[PDB]
C-alpha cells in the first residue's frame, strides 16, 4: 500500500515538496520523470519548494513569474493532487525581494504598506484559487530568543499587526483555504524552548485579536536532539506535548509540512544510519501524530539526493558522506524509514472530522 493510502484510511492527506528552480544540476526533482512517478504513487498532495515564494514570483518589479509553478501545478492537477501555497510571506529580509526590502515605507502611511501586502496576497490567492492550504506567514519567530523577526513591513506597522493583516488578506482572497503559520519550532530545552514560547505567544495574540488563522505548520526537520522516548527524554517529551496541547487548545489545527530527518549524528554505515533515522522518525511521529487535529503530512522531498539537507551548509557531515534523510534512497528504493512512517500511519488515531 502507498503512503497516501495509509494516510487516507485515517483521514489525513499525504504530500511532498517538488521543485524546479534551485539546485538543478544536483537536486533535480520535477524534471526527473521517474521521481515524478514515485511522488504520484506515494502522495496525493504537492507543495512547491520555492516556486511560489515571493523571491521567485516577483524578484524585481513588474508581473509575476508563474512559469515554473504553473508547470508543476498543471502536472499536479493531471495526477489528481491537492496543492498548497508555500509561502505568502517569509518574514526575514533575506527571504523578501531586494526591491521590497529597499522600499521607503516610513515616509508613507501604514495604509501604503497595507496596500502593498494586499496586492501581493490578492494576486497570489486569486491566481491559486484551487489551493487547499496557504502558508500565510513563514518563520516569523527568532529561534534564538523567541522574538519576532523584523522586516521593512513590521518596522512600519508592527510585527503582530503585519501578521494579523496578512492573515486577514489571505482569508479575504482565499476564503476556502486553510491558513497556516509555518515554522520549524520543535522539541528541545534551550533556544528551542524559547522558540516554542515565542510561537505560542504569537498564536495566542493572533487568536485573541480575532485573526483568521486556522493551523500551525510544524516543518518537522527533526534530528537526534528531537528524541523523545526513554527516561533521558522525559522532560523534552512532556514539554513538546504541552506545546501541542496549548496549540490545539487555542482551536488551531496542525500540519506536518516539511518532514525529513537530519542524519548528522548517526554513523557513516548506511544500514546503521537508516535504522537510526527510522527509529527517530517512529518516535517523533508517534508523539506528534497522536493529535487527531493534524490532518496533513508532507515530506520535504521523498528521495535523499533531492533533499535540501544535502547542500544546506549547517548540515554537512564531518565525513564527506551524503545525508540519507528521506524515506527513499538515491535509486528511488524504499528505506526502513518509509517502513517506520507506514507503521506510524497504521498505529495513529483516526483524525477528527
**CATH number, position 198:** 3.20.20.80
- Pairwise CA distance, residues 19 & 21, whole Å: 6
Neighbours of 144 (CB within 10 A): 11
Resolution (Å units): 2.6
Number of domains in the chain: 1
Cell 527568532 maps to which residue? 142
Q: Residue 177's closest CA among 219, 139, 137, 215?
A: 215
Neighbours of 14 (CB within 10 A): 22
Neighbours of 149 (CB within 10 A): 19
The secondary element (H helix, E strand) that includes residue 74 is helix 67-78
Pairing of strands 89-90, 13-18: unpaired
User: Is residue 204 assigned to a domain?
Assistant: yes
User: Is residue 337 assigned to a domain?
Assistant: yes
User: Is residue 89 assigned to a domain?
Assistant: yes
- Residues whose CB is less than 8 angstroms from the CB of residue 151 and which lie 6 or more positions away in sequence, other chains included: 91, 92, 93, 96, 101
- Pairwise CA distance, residues 44 & 201, whole Å: 33
User: Is residue 353 assigned to a domain?
Assistant: no
User: Is residue 33 assigned to a domain?
Assistant: yes
Q: Which domain holds residue 112?
A: 3-347
Helix, strand, coil percent values for the chain (each to nearest 5): 45, 15, 40
- Residues whose CB is less than 8 angstroms from the CB of residue 313 and which lie 6 or more positions away in sequence, other chains included: none
First CA to last CA across the chain, in angstroms? Answer: 23
Neighbours of 180 (CB within 10 A): 30
Question: What is the DSSP-derived secondary structure letter of residue 153?
Answer: T
User: Is residue 132 assigned to a domain?
Assistant: yes
**Angle of the 159-173 helix axis to the 191-208 helix axis, nearest 10:** 60
User: Is residue 352 assigned to a domain?
Assistant: no
Name the structure determination technique.
X-ray
User: Is residue 179 assigned to a domain?
Assistant: yes
The secondary element (H helix, E strand) that includes residue 211 is none
Instruction: Count each helix (H run) and each strand (E run) in the chain, helices first.
Output: 12, 10
- Pairwise CA distance, residues 110 & 125, whole Å: 22
| Widest CA span in the chain | 60
CB 155 within 8 A of CB 104: no
Amino acid at each position: 500500500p502507498a503512503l497516501k493510502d495509509l494516510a487516507k484510511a485515517k483521514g489525513m492527506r499525504f504530500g511532498s515538496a517538488i521543485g524546479l528552480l534551485e539546485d538543478q544540476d544536483t537536486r533535480k526533482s520535477f524534471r526527473d520523470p521517474a521521481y515524478r512517478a514515485l511522488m504520484a504513487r506515494e502522495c496525493n498532495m504537492i507543495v512547491a519548494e520555492n516556486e511560489t515564494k515571493w523571491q521567485a514570483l516577483q524578484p524585481k518589479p513588474g508581473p509575476y513569474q508563474w512559469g515554473p509553478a504553473d508547470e508543476m501545478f498543471a502536472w499536479a492537477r493531471k495526477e489528481g493532487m491537492a496543492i498548497r501555497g508555500h509561502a505568502l510571506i517569509w518574514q526575514d529580509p533575506k527571504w523578501l525581494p531586494a526591491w521590497v526590502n529597499a522600499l521607503d515605507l516610513k515616509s508613507k502611511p501604514v495604509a501604503h504598506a497595507e496596500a502593498i501586502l494586499r496586492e501581493h496576497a490578492k494576486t497570489v490567492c486569486t491566481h491559486l484559487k484551487d489551493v487547499i492550504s496557504h502558508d500565510v506567514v513563514n518563520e516569523a519567530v527568532s529561534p534564538k530568543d523567541g522574538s519576532l523577526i523584523q522586516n521593512v513591513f513590521t518596522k512600519r506597522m508592527g510585527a503582530v499587526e503585519q501578521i494579523e493583516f496578512a492573515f486577514r488578506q489571505a482569508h479575504e482572497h482565499a476564503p476556502k483555504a486553510q491558513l497556516v503559520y509555518n515554522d520549524f519550532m520543535g522539541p528541545g530545552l534551550g533556544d528551542r524552548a524559547k522558540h516554542r514560547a515565542g510561537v505560542l505567544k504569537l498564536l495566542a495574540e493572533l487568536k485573541k485579536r480575532g485573526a483568521p488563522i486556522h493551523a500551525l505548520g510544524l516543518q518537522s526537520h527533526i534530528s537526534a536532539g528531537d528524541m523523545m522516548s526513554g527516561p533521558a527524554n522525559a522532560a523534552v517529551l512532556r514539554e513538546w506535548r504541552k506545546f501541542l496541547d496549548e496549540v490545539t487548545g487555542m482551536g488551531l489545527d496542525l500540519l506536518i509540512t516539511e518532514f525529513d530527518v537530519n542524519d548528522k549524528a548517526f554513523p557513516a554505515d548506511f544500514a546503521k544510519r537508516d535504522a537510526a533515522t527510522a527509529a527517530l522518525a517512529r518516535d517523533y511521529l508517534d508523539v506528534t501524530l497522536s493529535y487527531p487535529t493534524c490532518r496533513d503530512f508532507l515530506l520535504w522531498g521523498m528521495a535523499d539526493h533531492v533533499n535540501w539537507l544535502q547542500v544546506w551548509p549547517d548540515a554537512k557531515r564531518p565525513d564527506g558522506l551524503a545525508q540519507r534523510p528521506t524515506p527513499y534512497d538515491s535509486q528511488l528504493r524504499p528505506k526502513p524509514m518509509r517502513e517506520a512512517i507506514a507503521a506510524s500511519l497504521r498505529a495513529m488515531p483516526m483524525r477528527k472530522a
